[model samples]
Target: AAFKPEELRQALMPTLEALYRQDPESLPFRQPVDPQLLGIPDYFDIVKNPMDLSTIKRKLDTGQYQEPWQYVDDVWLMFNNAWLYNRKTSRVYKFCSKLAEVFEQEIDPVMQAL
Candidate 1:
């Protein structure tokens, strides 16, 4: 069943915290990240609405965050794990390609702004 946006919002933080607290060795990743690095203090700032691109952009503009690529890769890995668990192989590939496309399109413009 699909979660309501508010339901998802209420659940997101604890879920992320739990996942972040888990030992990396427990994950299937061949090169899992350290749990400590995942304790991103600004996570809530950027993800005020996980489904809102505008919220993400606004947070990015604050200049109070970690390296964006690390944040992106960490979130991608989290999403990939969920997709894999749900047997959404095609969706995973599509998401990866779409993310790559966004990075390719935005990188030059972002560089100019920096």
Candidate 2:
């Protein structure tokens, strides 16, 4: 079964907002980082648009994500992947872990029902 964009946003937004509000510095980089510095396009410039099906589908296909919940999980990991590379001083490592707990709390019941 498919998940609604609103449901995804509702499940994710509160935790994300809380984290950013608590400490913007905890994030690896500000959203509009210099493209040259990253050697990539402004892909992460905007927050994930829950309604952006084309982009979401592209990510799902690229990652071969099988479950609907995995799509949401991937969004958090896409940015947080850098933290996994260097765990020593990275707040993102801790942040993503907390985020995962929040995500599981939100998604597990709905997933179990399905």
Candidate 3:
């Protein structure tokens, strides 16, 4: 399924209108680049593959950083990937919404500290 320009515009109209009302240049929610087609699914497939334990062992062979910085790095990478793919989960959304949720859900308090 593909999302048409009109549909995308409709989806983003509220955000766009609010921004335009504030400032033309500040018009947030820039519509998708390729529109015209409709019916794009709100969700997409997330690819997952078997973990390579050997690669993990090699990366964390030193067993450094106390508990596990490597594991932390992997989780952060996954979270960032989700942020990239999810339109509603953009960096701006993080500042506006997800950041609060992360703290409230006790997810990433340490990062929020800085």
lDDT (0 to 1) per candidate: 0.38, 0.48, 0.34
Model 2 residue runs over 4 Å out of place are 1-67
Candidate that would win on lDDT: 2
Worst 10 residues of 1 by lDDT: 25-34
Per-residue lDDT for 17 in model 1?
35
> What's each prediction's TM-score?
0.29, 0.41, 0.25
User: Tens digit of lDDT per residue, candidate 1, span 1-114?
Assistant: 433434333333332333323443223322232235766455444333232223333334443234444334444554444343324455534553444344445444443433
Off by over 4 Å in 1: 1-63, 66-89
Off by over 4 Å in 3: 1-67, 89-114
Candidate ranking (lDDT, best to worst):
2, 1, 3
Q: Candidate 1, after superposition: displacement of residue 27 in Å?
A: 23
**Per-residue C-alpha lDDT of model 3 across residues 1-114, encoded as one tens digit per residue:** 443444433333332233324322222223221222424343234323222223333334433323333344543443344455446745543432433233234323432331
